[PDB]
Write a protein that binds this ligand. Structure first.
Ligand SMILES: [Zn+2]
Ligand SMILES: [Zn+2]
Ligand SMILES: [Zn+2]
Ligand SMILES: [Zn+2]
Ligand SMILES: [Zn+2]
Lengths: 41, 49, 37, 92, 45, 279, 110
């Protein structure tokens, strides 16, 4: 969901009215389920 | 305002170069320089104090 | 479709940068003179 | 039969937000996939410990998406893609 | 101090200098200047 | 010698020139007798429309990319010619560390202000006798912690140790000698709401541990014992003020601590439950 | 505006286009200039021998300039030289040099 990581580090909710005044990026994070392997062949 | 290229050309049609001289010097940038008599190049260090 | 993670964000966001939960993985961790003579 | 006329409108195609972003996001993930592999090869070469946080740089996606919609450029490849919103009236 | 108003709950805070930009109770940060207390004269024309 | 032109009114000659400048006309007038001094004032905000000595100094450089209708081999000759001339200066390690600084700062999601003070701190030490070796990452991570304190941020040693391998005892003493360099070149409350952001807690609950951690210092007894666990028992007390289902096992794996430690701190806290209420 | 002088005030008539001799520049320039820096090491004044020494003409009103004195509304500047150890061609004279080589000998030079 759209969020802002502030300068201290709080990553909370977001609304575009505040995003228009604080000059930010109405943006959401993306995450990837990574899988690690090792072949020994 | 910008004194354009073609606006100069209409003044040549009349021909009053005194207005052409007054506009591009005093209304523009004016400068008094010095050059040597031999090598006609801007080289003379002036100290007219 | 792509699922949406719907919580208080900063719980999921805490594992992004620093989190003080290191490693948890095993992936790429790397005489006498006459006697000796 | 006559010559093929390129001024036929149906022979042209349009690109909205999606197929524009498909060109961009393929390239941004293309850059990061090699740089993750750069963290793979250098770790086993210089013999250190692996770190998934240091393996993936978020600025490959962050600076890519911010700077593209900042200017009208997309790549200088493509130009003038983004414009500011016209708010002289509601009809604008 | 100068009188400051919150964005959402419009709570009168009226803090001072070097007092951080953070509203009480609500977690907003958009603060306001608040209007003066002296009269303003106009014209009908 | 001198090289300062003092513009004075010869009509007045009563004081140093308390004058006026007509910026709308580009002239400077005497603010007494009403006489102009010099026409054609040059401007300052005009040349900046078409456009760092604080870090780069007087050093300049010019990137030489390819053209558009050129030969690709010619750029290879220049970058080899640029390659042989990289030993004329020693700032190549500085920008390479700065790239590593920018690599660490952005991966730590820290803002560009922290990018400023860290490169500010590294340029102060740079290369002196008191360094000698120090594994490079250590003086980097120290200047990272300089950006934590100077830009009023809240970072911990294990937070950097979760990123870099600095082996602590090497890390702190190298951080200590850099402080004496800063001394030779002349507050746990910020750490609170990040953990509240890590737990996802409301603002009234967030300021509840704030009034807890404020009054915990003035109450005294048992003293410091590191404020990190003192912060987290302010969390556990104020979450025992309410009913949020977290307990000690989940918060133990969260901030990486000890469940048995905070119950011992809970022992002195339940006695101190009196002098902590506000409403 | 400008300070009064007594040089003969005339006009320009015939204008000759010509090229530079290198010793002629040395009989005109005033500084060698070896430092590639701009201002002082102390981030003030000048390098003195760098890219903008006070031996050249200055600007910025309050600065006085050395040899010209006066201000930026009067000083027309000066000129300096940089000599090398290896000559190179000019971009505007590439093919015009090439046509000379296509017309003269390479040994006796006739
Ligand atoms: Zn409020
Ligand atoms: Zn003297
Ligand atoms: Zn006056
Ligand atoms: Zn001069
Ligand atoms: Zn011959």
């Amino acid at each position: 969901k759209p969020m802002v990581n502030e300068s201290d580090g709080v990553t909370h909710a977001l609304y575009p009215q505040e995003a228009r005044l604080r000059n930010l990026t109405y943006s959401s994070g993306l995450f990837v389920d990574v899988k690690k392997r090792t072949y020994e062949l | 305002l910008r004194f354009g290229e073609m606006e100069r050309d209409c003044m040549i049609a009349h021909g009053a170069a005194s207005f052409l001289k007054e506009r591009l010097m005093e209304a523009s940038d004016a400068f008094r320089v010095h050059i040597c008599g031999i090598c006609g190049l801007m080289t003379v260090i002036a100290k007219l104090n | 479709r792509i699922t949406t993670l719907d919580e208080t964000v900063g719980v999921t966001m805490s594992h992004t940068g620093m989190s003080m939960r290191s490693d948890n993985s095993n992936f790429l961790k790397v005489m006498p003179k006459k006697e000796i003579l | 039969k006559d010559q093929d006329d390129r001024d036929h409108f149906g022979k042209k195609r349009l690109d909205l937000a999606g197929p524009l972003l498909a060109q961009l996001f393929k390239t941004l993930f293309k850059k990061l996939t090699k740089d993750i592999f750069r963290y793979m090869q250098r770790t086993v070469e210089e013999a250190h410990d692996f770190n998934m946080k240091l393996a993936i740089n978020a600025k490959t996606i962050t600076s890519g998406l911010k700077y593209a919609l900042a200017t009208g450029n997309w790549g200088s490849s493509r130009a003038g893609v983004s414009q500011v919103l016209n708010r002289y009236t509601y009809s604008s | 101090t100068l009188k400051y108003i919150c964005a959402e709950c419009s709570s009168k805070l009226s803090l001072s200098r070097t007092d951080a930009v953070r509203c009480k109770d609500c977690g907003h940060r958009i603060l306001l200047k608040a209007r003066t207390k002296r009269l303003v004269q106009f014209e009908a024309r | 010698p001198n090289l300062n032109i003092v513009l004075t009114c010869p009509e007045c000659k009563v004081y140093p020139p308390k004058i006026v400048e007509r910026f709308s006309e580009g002239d400077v007038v005497c603010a007494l007798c009403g006489l102009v001094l010099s026409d054609k004032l040059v401007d300052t905000r005009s040349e900046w429309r078409t456009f760092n000595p604080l870090l780069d100094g007087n050093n300049l450089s010019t990137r030489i990319g390819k053209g558009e209708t050129t030969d690709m081999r010619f750029t290879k000759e220049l970058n080899k010619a640029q390659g042989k001339n990289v030993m004329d200066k020693k700032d190549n390690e500085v920008q390479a560390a700065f790239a590593k600084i920018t690599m660490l700062c952005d991966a730590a999601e820290l803002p560009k202000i922290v990018k400023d003070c860290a490169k500010e701190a590294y340029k102060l030490c740079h290369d002196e006798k008191t360094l000698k070796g120090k594994s490079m990452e250590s003086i980097m991570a120290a200047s990272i912690l300089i950006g934590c304190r100077r830009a009023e941020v809240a970072r911990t040693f294990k937070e950097i140790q979760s990123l870099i391998h600095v082996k602590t005892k090497e890390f702190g003493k190298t951080l200590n000698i850099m402080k004496n360099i800063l001394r030779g070149k002349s507050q746990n409350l910020t750490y609170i709401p990040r953990f509240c952001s890590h737990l996802g807690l409301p603002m009234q609950v967030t300021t509840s541990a704030e009034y807890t951690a404020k009054k915990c210092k003035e109450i005294k007894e048992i003293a410091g014992k590191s404020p990190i666990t003192i912060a987290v028992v302010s969390i556990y007390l104020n979450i025992l003020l309410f009913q949020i289902p977290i307990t000690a096992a989940k918060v133990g794996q969260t901030l990486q601590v000890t469940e048995g430690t905070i119950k011992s701190g809970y022992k002195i806290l339940y006695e101190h439950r009196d002098k902590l209420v506000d409403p | 505006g400008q300070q009064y002088s007594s040089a003969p005030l005339r006009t320009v008539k015939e204008v000759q286009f010509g090229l530079f001799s290198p010793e002629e520049v040395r009989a005109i320039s005033v500084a060698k200039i070896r430092f590639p820096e701009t201002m002082d090491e102390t981030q003030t004044r000048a390098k003195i021998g760098g890219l903008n020494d006070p031996r050249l003409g200055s600007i910025d009103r309050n600065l006085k300039c050395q040899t010209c004195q006066e201000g930026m509304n009067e000083c027309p500047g000066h000129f300096g030289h940089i000599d090398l150890a290896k000559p190179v061609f000019h971009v505007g004279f590439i093919a015009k040099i090439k046509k000379v080589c296509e017309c003269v000998c390479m040994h006796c030079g006739k």
